[PDB]
RNA sequence: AGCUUUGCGCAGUGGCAGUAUCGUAGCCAAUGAGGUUUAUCCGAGGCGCGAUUAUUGCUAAUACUUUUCCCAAUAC
């Protein structure tokens, strides 16, 4: 069903992101960088 | 051999709103949920409960003194 498909997709995404965050918690993958863009150039790296 | 439609995944680029998002070994539901209008007509979720910054994670802001050397005859 549409609800079952959406539920399956959501569970898969949550499992993937939870495993990724556990990997980040255990040094296997360095912590994510802020997603800087042109509009983000001055909120993240203003002084720089 | 291109063109193109539908649904589903993975992404990328955006825009919009935080009075909403999610859960449902709880209950009911196309053998019909819900019906205010269009009712011899429409046609799906609804109720109860639970979590919460009205989804959830991170990142950052909120500091200096241990050590270690010393005075002396060309003489009764």
Curated annotation (Swiss-Prot):
How does it associate, per the subunit comment?
Component of the precatalytic spliceosome (spliceosome B complex). Component of the U4/U6-U5 tri-snRNP complex, a building block of the precatalytic spliceosome (spliceosome B complex). The U4/U6-U5 tri-snRNP complex is composed of the U4, U6 and U5 snRNAs and at least PRPF3, PRPF4, PRPF6, PRPF8, PRPF31, SNRNP200, TXNL4A, SNRNP40, SNRPB, SNRPD1, SNRPD2, SNRPD3, SNRPE, SNRPF, SNRPG, DDX23, CD2BP2, PPIH, SNU13, EFTUD2, SART1 and USP39, plus LSM2, LSM3, LSM4, LSM5, LSM6, LSM7 and LSM8. Interacts directly with PRPF4.
According to its UniProt record, how is this protein modified after translation?
Ubiquitinated. Undergoes 'Lys-63'-linked polyubiquitination by PRPF19 and deubiquitination by USP4. 'Lys-63'-linked ubiquitination increases the affinity for PRPF8 and may regulate the assembly of the U4/U6-U5 tri-snRNP complex.
Record's function text: Plays a role in pre-mRNA splicing as component of the U4/U6-U5 tri-snRNP complex that is involved in spliceosome assembly, and as component of the precatalytic spliceosome (spliceosome B complex).
Q: In which tissues is it expressed?
A: Highly expressed in retina, liver, kidney and blood. Detected at lower levels in heart and brain.
Annotated compartments = Nucleus; Nucleus speckle
What disease is this chain connected with?
Retinitis pigmentosa 18: A retinal dystrophy belonging to the group of pigmentary retinopathies. Retinitis pigmentosa is characterized by retinal pigment deposits visible on fundus examination and primary loss of rod photoreceptor cells followed by secondary loss of cone photoreceptors. Patients typically have night vision blindness and loss of midperipheral visual field. As their condition progresses, they lose their far peripheral visual field and eventually central vision as well.
- What is this protein's record name? U4/U6 small nuclear ribonucleoprotein Prp3
Q: Where are the membrane-spanning stretches?
A: none
**Domain of life here?**
Eukaryota
